[PDB]
Amino acid sequence: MASLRDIKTRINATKKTSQITKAMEMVSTSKLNRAEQNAKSFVPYMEKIQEVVANVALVSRPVKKTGYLVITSDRGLAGAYNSNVLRLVYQTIQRHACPDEYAIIVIGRVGLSFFRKRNVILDITRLPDQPSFADIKEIARKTVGLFADTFDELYMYYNHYVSAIQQEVTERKLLPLTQEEILDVLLPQYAESLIYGALLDAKASEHAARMTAMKNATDNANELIRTLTLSYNRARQAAITQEITEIVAGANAL
Amino acid sequence: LTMAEYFRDEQQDVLLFIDNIFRFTQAGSEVSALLGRMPSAVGYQPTLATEMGQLQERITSTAKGSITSIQAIYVPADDYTDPAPATTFSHLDATTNLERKLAEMGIYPAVDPLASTSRALAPEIVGEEHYQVARKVQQTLQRYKELQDIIAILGMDELSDEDKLVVHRARRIQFFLSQNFHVAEQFTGQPGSYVPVKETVRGFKEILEGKYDHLPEDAFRLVGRIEEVVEKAKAMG
To answer: Which InterPro entries match (chain A)?
Structure first.
């Protein structure tokens, strides 16, 4: 059964698919080893904050637990990198309280996509720069993230990074328990700092999760060849057998 | 055939059960060679078509008596393009095309939900309610069919929150299309079921209408009336 020239169309389609796939894997592998570059470049600033935030012996539990911050990408083909975080979020919101309460900030369309239809939205972030996340326009989110305090005690949701592509989703928390007495300046510069680091590790995941999801596809696509190469040969055979049988059977007729 | 033709033209309605009408045409080619005939496509008898025409129309109901016939049609090498079953198609008012794929899926009877047809599917025959569901099922089964290459390459991750739903329904609908055949039991050990038409029509409605979008697939596998699915559902935990 089936065609031949319809088996070629499939092979070549698959091939050009594997191509485009493996392209992006390498491309997203090129965006892992630039995540360090902006990961490193942030190593010092973090050190020289906890060193400052050494904490004198001389805002603890205020009232509630309210808003979240949910880190993602705008682009797809990342494996579950999105759905996962967008699960914990959706769980420990509805595992939380069930009024229209418990509010939200999202980074990357894909997040805002689900969050939108569900309700409880607060802010927006689109077009993060990819491997180089611009520390700048995340600074506008620290402001919204803090000044929002209209708020109490936020948690941040994203994926961590351990060794190339292997990763896991987390809730580290932040806005609680870890001139003179200038907290008006450390409170802010300690959130701007965390929401940022969160990204670098988020993105590091993104590219990774994509680097892989674009391997799984490549690898799989490559198997689609085997499954077709086989059905092509078979249809290559029955065809060359029918053609011949036709050419002889038309001679014996003479 | 002549047997059934008796009760039809000499007296009542008749059920003609012909098991593998293929073997007729098949044996045909066996002789066609020795007759000194010019072989046709695939090496079949140059008369294959007509030889079947002269034995089909005979199996028909008249103003005298009625003949409801059900014929088993073997598919050589799973090729529906083979002259035997191919040529046979234009001989039936209703077909049930069985697929090996669906069979290994565990879907029994393994019946193509998008291939099998009947002249009955008309609103002018089966009623509107039964019609629209009919296509509704097929619609969502096809929409799942198209999606399959992506799933097979990219998994379900990059599908929309709308296409995913269609993947669930479709599956569970393609599973509910499985049935317990009384002539099974001795093997599997399950008893069996005859699902009334009103209950099939309804069962799928709810599924398309989403009363069941919570129940896992496996619950819908190998059952009768839709109620049973709910039963076998809780049994799951």
So the answer is: ATP_synth_F1_ATPase_gsu, ATP_synth_F1_gsu, ATP_synth_F1_gsu_CS
A1·B154 Cβ contact <8 A? no
Q: Which positions ≥6 away from B110 have C-beta within 8 Å?
A: B98, B99, B100, B101, B102, B103
What chain A residue is nearest to B150 in terms of C-alpha separation? A217
> How is residue B98 annotated by DSSP?
B
Task: Indicate yes or no: CB of A17 within 8 angstroms of CB of B154.
Answer: no
Resolution in A: 3.9
- Experimental technique behind these coordinates: X-ray
Q: What are phi and psi of A161, to 5 degrees?
A: -135, 115
Chain A contact set for B42 (CB, 8 A): 242
Question: A4 CB contacts (<8 Å, ≥6 apart)?
Answer: A232, A235, A236, A239
Q: How far is CA A206 from each of CA A75, A131, A169, A253, rounded to the nearest angstrom?
A: 9, 9, 12, 68
Residue of chain A nearest B151, judged by CA positions: A217
Taken in order of first residue, the domains within chain A and their CATH numbers are 2-58+179-254 (1.10.287.80), 59-178 (3.40.1380.10)
A238 inside 8 A of chain B by CB: no
Euclidean distance between CA atoms B136 and B143, whole angstroms? 11
Using the Cα atoms of residue B129, residue B132, residue B138 and residue B141 in order, give the sign of their dihedral. negative
Q: Nearest CB to A83: which of B43, B77, B157?
A: B157
Q: Give the CATH fold of the B121-237 domain.
A: 1.10.1140
Q: Report the run of H or E that residue B82 belongs to, with start and end.
A: none
Among candidate residues B169, B182, B179, B191, the one with its CA nearest the CA of residue B225: B179
Instruction: Name the amino acid, one letter, at B188.
Output: T
